[PDB]
Structures are given as structure tokens and as C-alpha cells.
């Protein structure tokens, strides 16, 4: 015979746009995530510099 489609017909294939949204790129959790790192970092930086400042007192 000849190259023919299957008797049922080939199943439908994906062609419509599929770029689904994901939570890893929504800005609201990203903004919350960035704020926490900055807040945590400044908490550690206040404690760090205050300690460093006390070390200069002892050294002097």
C-alpha cells in the first residue's frame, strides 16, 4: 500500500501557546524574599559593627 494515516487518525498535538505562570517569578514573593534578606542582614550588621566597635575599644 501507500503511506497512510492510522485508521483512527493521529491524535491531536499541542500547538497553542503554553507559557504558564510560575510562583518562582511572581514579584510579590520575590519582593518579600528580598526584604527578609535585607532585614536579616541589617540585624546581623548592627550586631557585627557594635561588636567590632567594642574590639577597637579593647585594642586602644
Amino acid at each position: 500500500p501507500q503511506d497512510m494515516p492510522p485508521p483512527g487518525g493521529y491524535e491531536a498535538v499541542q500547538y497553542k501557546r503554553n507559557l504558564p505562570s510560575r510562583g518562582l517569578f511572581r514579584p510579590r514573593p520575590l519582593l518579600a524574599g528580598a526584604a527578609v534578606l535585607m532585614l536579616y542582614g541589617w540585624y546581623k550588621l548592627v550586631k557585627g559593627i557594635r561588636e567590632q566597635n567594642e574590639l577597637a575599644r579593647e585594642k586602644m
Binding site: G48, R50, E51, Q52, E54, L55, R57, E58, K59
Partner: protein, 167 residues
Amino acid sequence: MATRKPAFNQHVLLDTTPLPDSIPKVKEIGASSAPLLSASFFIGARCKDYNDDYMQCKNENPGRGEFECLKEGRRVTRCARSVLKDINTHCLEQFRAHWQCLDNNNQQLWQCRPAEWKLNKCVYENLKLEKVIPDQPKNSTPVHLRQRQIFAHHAIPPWERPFIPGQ
């Protein structure tokens, strides 16, 4: 000679002429930087008055403080020498531990807290000289009595405790 920082020195000039006999002699302190630093607060504890008196003598005679403060200069050398004599007769092993750690750790006092706490305790129990730092924030533990050090290269073990006198 001037207190300017040199940039092109290639030579050292020495003078072997001694001091005139009219000036009483004194043995210069023969301790290196790292031992002096492990013993600095101990020297401060015992000789603070003589140190202050010597500095006040110089301020009383501006431009002339090298001379006419020599007798007060001699006292400061003898008192400091008494602390390095007493420590070397009572805390030698703990003293050598702290200043050898200090010499290996960029002379950074916060890198040798376990060795410091051992010496602080031994010195206090034989010489009654205690380390004190004026005006540390009353709302925090004194930095030299803190179990953890933020800037320490190696973490302070949890079995090495600060020496707080009276406990």
C-alpha cells in the same frame, strides 16, 4: 629625630654614647610586643597611677617633657617590670600560651580568648590584678567576656568559659 614616616631610608644611625652618670640608671624593659600585649591590662591595673603621673608631668612641661620628667619615666619602667616579673614567677605557662597565640594571630586579642581567660584567672588568683575596660555598653556583656566572638577565625569551643571574678 623627627616623627615623620620615612619613605627612602637605606641606612640606620646608632650612637654608643651612654647617658651621663648624673642621671640614675634604669634597666630597659626586655619584653617583646606580644608578651607586652598579653600583660598590658595587668600593667595597666598596677601602674595606672604612675603612667598617668608620667604623662601629666610631660603635659605640665610642654616642649620640655623628655627632660625634667626622667625620674617619673624611671618609675613607669620599674612598675611595668614588676608586673612582668610577678607574672613570669606565677603564671608562666599560661602567660606563654596567651602571648604565643597572640603572636600567631596578628596580635588580635579576640583570636585568643581561651588562652586569655586561662591567664586572666591565674593572674587574678596570685596577683589580684584584674582586667578592666572603661565605658563598655552596660546593656551588653563586655566584649572580652563574650562566649562567642563574631570576628574570630576559629569558633571558641563551648567548654572554654570566660573568667568572671567572684564566681
